[PDB]
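Final report, section 2: Outcomes. Of the targets proposed, Mitogen-activated protein kinase 10 is the one most frequently requested by collaborating groups, and we therefore present its record in full.
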Amino acid sequence: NQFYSVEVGDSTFTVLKRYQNLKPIGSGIVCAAYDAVLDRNVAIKKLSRPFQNQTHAKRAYRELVLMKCVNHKNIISLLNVFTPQKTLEEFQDVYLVMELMDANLCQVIQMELDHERMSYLLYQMLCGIKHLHSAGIIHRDLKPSNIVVKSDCTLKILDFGLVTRYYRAPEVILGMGYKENVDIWSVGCIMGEMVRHKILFPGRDYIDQWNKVIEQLGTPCPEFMKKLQPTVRNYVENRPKYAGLTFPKLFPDSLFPADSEHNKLKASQARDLLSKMLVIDPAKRISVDDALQHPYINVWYDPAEVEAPPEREHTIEEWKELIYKEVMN
Ligand SMILES: O=c1n(C2CCOCC2)nc(-c2ccnc(NC3CCCCC3)c2)n1-c1ccc2ccccc2c1
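The predicted structure is given below as tokens.
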């Protein structure tokens, strides 16, 4: 046989014969293929020995399990799951199949800012994020490289969350505990980068990253401070203080289209949602539902899309069988 092996760079793709003309589309190594059974192009992801360590295995199992707990157009949906290996003893690799997409969100970020497309992309992120939260899934590590887009501007989130750390919320950076609106920060970080065309909060580690957060947004309120653990609290309170730049100064008018009255209004609304999403204190940060009702977003609102019906430690030997069972069903 049912399988055939093809060399794609260094790794060998042993896939079902239904999948033809494999081409590399990013590195878990990923391939574009034509599905002869479905008569449509697919993306196939190869998990090379996912059971190899606690980190690789826990994510692989969790995400394989969650891909059947989720049913939404803005979240990845599996078309097929298979392994070439015949038994548990021989079991090495896992191959995952989904609809082929046109672009990564990193590429779309580089593009010129258009309000119709930006708001629809952001609307879709919020729909997917809401669908996860409705199913009891808070992402905590939402980033553009794990988001894919079609030419018709339809969007899909590829992973299920908790390496690029820039889009992580203050509560993740400082280990605070969280609610659903932790993912709002990440959305704000993507939305801001689409405007500035620069990573808002860069850094080689969390120290640099936090410095970038406070320099631009200012030192958080005392209420935020007392929610920190004593050792983290000590560090944050003893950081050099900043007033924080205003959002008109964070994202100047020059970064927005202002050739019409429609664009001038949408620019103020966009800067306004940013000021409600890029809020350090999660107690003050906008929720998913309120972000969906915001004038900049609610133009796309749809009840069918928005309002949709919805862990242990093991050895490498135990993870192998757990993953194998899910593949074989
Ligand atoms: O894992 C990825 N990535 C990248 C790899 C590079 O680093 C970041 C994540 N890109 C895609 C993927 C999915 C669908 N379509 C595409 N198409 C590409 C065509 C070329 C231009 C970029 C998008 C990629 N996938 C991918 C592919 C199949 C998958 C199957 C099941 C579950 C998740 C999957 C994810």
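Residues 25-28, 30, 43, 45, 76, 96-98, 100-101, 103-104, 145-146, 148, 158 surround 589 (CB under 6 Å).
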